[PDB]
Design a protein around this motif. Structure first.
Motif, PDB file in Angstrom:
ATOM      1  N   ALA A   1       0.835  -1.179   0.000  1.00 38.99           N
ATOM      2  CA  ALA A   1       0.000   0.000   0.000  1.00 38.99           C
ATOM      3  C   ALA A   1       0.878   1.240   0.000  1.00 38.99           C
ATOM      4  N   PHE A   2       0.916   1.921  -1.131  1.00 39.54           N
ATOM      5  CA  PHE A   2       1.761   3.091  -1.291  1.00 39.54           C
ATOM      6  C   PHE A   2       1.239   4.259  -0.483  1.00 39.54           C
ATOM      7  N   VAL A   3       2.167   5.092  -0.054  1.00 39.34           N
ATOM      8  CA  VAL A   3       1.881   6.169   0.871  1.00 39.34           C
ATOM      9  C   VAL A   3       1.203   7.346   0.156  1.00 39.34           C
ATOM     10  N   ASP A   4       0.979   7.186  -1.146  1.00 41.81           N
ATOM     11  CA  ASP A   4       0.263   8.187  -1.934  1.00 41.81           C
ATOM     12  C   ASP A   4      -1.235   7.898  -1.941  1.00 41.81           C
ATOM     13  N   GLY A   5      -1.592   6.649  -1.662  1.00 36.96           N
ATOM     14  CA  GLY A   5      -2.990   6.262  -1.664  1.00 36.96           C
ATOM     15  C   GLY A   5      -3.259   5.035  -2.514  1.00 36.96           C
ATOM     16  N   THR A   6      -2.331   4.713  -3.403  1.00 38.84           N
ATOM     17  CA  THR A   6      -2.459   3.539  -4.259  1.00 38.84           C
ATOM     18  C   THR A   6      -1.958   2.285  -3.550  1.00 38.84           C
ATOM     19  N   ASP A   7      -2.180   1.128  -4.159  1.00 36.83           N
ATOM     20  CA  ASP A   7      -1.660  -0.130  -3.632  1.00 36.83           C
ATOM     21  C   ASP A   7      -0.953  -0.885  -4.749  1.00 36.83           C
ATOM     22  N   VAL A   8      -0.460  -2.071  -4.437  1.00 37.13           N
ATOM     23  CA  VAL A   8       0.218  -2.900  -5.421  1.00 37.13           C
ATOM     24  C   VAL A   8       0.240  -4.342  -4.953  1.00 37.13           C
ATOM     25  N   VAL A   9       0.264  -5.264  -5.895  1.00 40.96           N
ATOM     26  CA  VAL A   9       0.312  -6.675  -5.565  1.00 40.96           C
ATOM     27  C   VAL A   9       1.437  -7.371  -6.326  1.00 40.96           C
ATOM     28  N   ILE A  10       2.228  -8.141  -5.600  1.00 44.06           N
ATOM     29  CA  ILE A  10       3.348  -8.856  -6.182  1.00 44.06           C
ATOM     30  C   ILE A  10       3.028 -10.341  -6.258  1.00 44.06           C
ATOM     31  N   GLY A  11       3.372 -10.956  -7.382  1.00 47.25           N
ATOM     32  CA  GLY A  11       3.099 -12.365  -7.572  1.00 47.25           C
ATOM     33  C   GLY A  11       4.115 -13.251  -6.885  1.00 47.25           C
TER      34      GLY A  11
ATOM     35  N   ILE B   1       9.886 -11.242  -9.599  1.00 49.08           N
ATOM     36  CA  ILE B   1      10.849 -10.218  -9.213  1.00 49.08           C
ATOM     37  C   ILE B   1      10.488  -8.892  -9.877  1.00 49.08           C
ATOM     38  N   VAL B   2      10.391  -7.839  -9.080  1.00 46.29           N
ATOM     39  CA  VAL B   2       9.999  -6.535  -9.587  1.00 46.29           C
ATOM     40  C   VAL B   2      10.675  -5.438  -8.772  1.00 46.29           C
ATOM     41  N   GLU B   3      11.056  -4.356  -9.427  1.00 47.87           N
ATOM     42  CA  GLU B   3      11.739  -3.277  -8.741  1.00 47.87           C
ATOM     43  C   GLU B   3      10.785  -2.118  -8.498  1.00 47.87           C
ATOM     44  N   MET B   4      10.808  -1.602  -7.276  1.00 50.81           N
ATOM     45  CA  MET B   4       9.920  -0.518  -6.873  1.00 50.81           C
ATOM     46  C   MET B   4      10.304   0.775  -7.584  1.00 50.81           C
ATOM     47  N   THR B   5       9.722   0.982  -8.754  1.00 53.88           N
ATOM     48  CA  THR B   5      10.043   2.122  -9.588  1.00 53.88           C
ATOM     49  C   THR B   5       8.837   3.046  -9.757  1.00 53.88           C
ATOM     50  N   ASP B   6       8.910   3.942 -10.732  1.00 58.23           N
ATOM     51  CA  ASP B   6       7.841   4.906 -10.975  1.00 58.23           C
ATOM     52  C   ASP B   6       6.589   4.221 -11.507  1.00 58.23           C
ATOM     53  N   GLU B   7       6.775   3.259 -12.410  1.00 58.73           N
ATOM     54  CA  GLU B   7       5.657   2.490 -12.944  1.00 58.73           C
ATOM     55  C   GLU B   7       4.960   1.730 -11.830  1.00 58.73           C
ATOM     56  N   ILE B   8       5.745   1.379 -10.834  1.00 62.39           N
ATOM     57  CA  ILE B   8       5.261   0.722  -9.643  1.00 62.39           C
ATOM     58  C   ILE B   8       4.497   1.701  -8.755  1.00 62.39           C
ATOM     59  N   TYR B   9       5.136   2.812  -8.457  1.00 60.77           N
ATOM     60  CA  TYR B   9       4.573   3.801  -7.562  1.00 60.77           C
ATOM     61  C   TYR B   9       4.068   5.005  -8.350  1.00 60.77           C
TER      62      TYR B   9
ATOM     63  N   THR C   1       2.222   8.061  -8.510  1.00 60.28           N
ATOM     64  CA  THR C   1       1.754   9.061  -7.571  1.00 60.28           C
ATOM     65  C   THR C   1       0.603   9.869  -8.160  1.00 60.28           C
ATOM     66  N   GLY C   2      -0.461  10.019  -7.379  1.00 64.26           N
ATOM     67  CA  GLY C   2      -1.627  10.742  -7.839  1.00 64.26           C
ATOM     68  C   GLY C   2      -1.506  12.231  -7.610  1.00 64.26           C
ATOM     69  N   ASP C   3      -0.970  12.614  -6.458  1.00 66.56           N
ATOM     70  CA  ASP C   3      -0.798  14.026  -6.137  1.00 66.56           C
ATOM     71  C   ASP C   3       0.465  14.563  -6.796  1.00 66.56           C
ATOM     72  N   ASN C   4       1.610  14.286  -6.186  1.00 60.48           N
ATOM     73  CA  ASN C   4       2.891  14.708  -6.725  1.00 60.48           C
ATOM     74  C   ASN C   4       4.022  14.027  -5.977  1.00 60.48           C
TER      75      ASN C   4
END
Length: 76
Positions: A49-59, A63-71, A73-76
């Motif tokens: 659960a990203f601190v911007d308000g979004t979430d994410v699920v990993i299989g 293997i995945v890197e926490m990048t911009d496509e990952i996070y 951001t809705g605000d900024n």
């Protein structure tokens, strides 16, 4: 590094490779930081659960890197 999200759901075998290539084991409620490489094994399933308000699920065994496509951001 700043914590960009946090674990709300987790399952299976999981690890995160921080930006030093340091593999840290993940558990529920652990902080995710920008640039870490998550390593799941077998029945791995994680919800970051990203601190911007979004979430994410990993299989699993994934293997995945926490990048911009990952996070996305809705605000900024």
């Amino acid at each position: 590094g700043n914590a960009i999200g946090f674990i709300t759901k987790l399952d299976g075998s999981v690890t995160v490779q921080s930006i030093n290539g340091q593999e840290r084991v993940l558990k529920l409620g652990d902080p995710i930081f920008f640039g870490e490489t998550v390593l799941t094994g077998g029945s791995g399933s994680v919800t970051i659960a990203f601190v911007d308000g979004t979430d994410v699920v990993i299989g699993g065994d994934s293997i995945v890197e926490m990048t911009d496509e990952i996070y996305n951001t809705g605000d900024n």
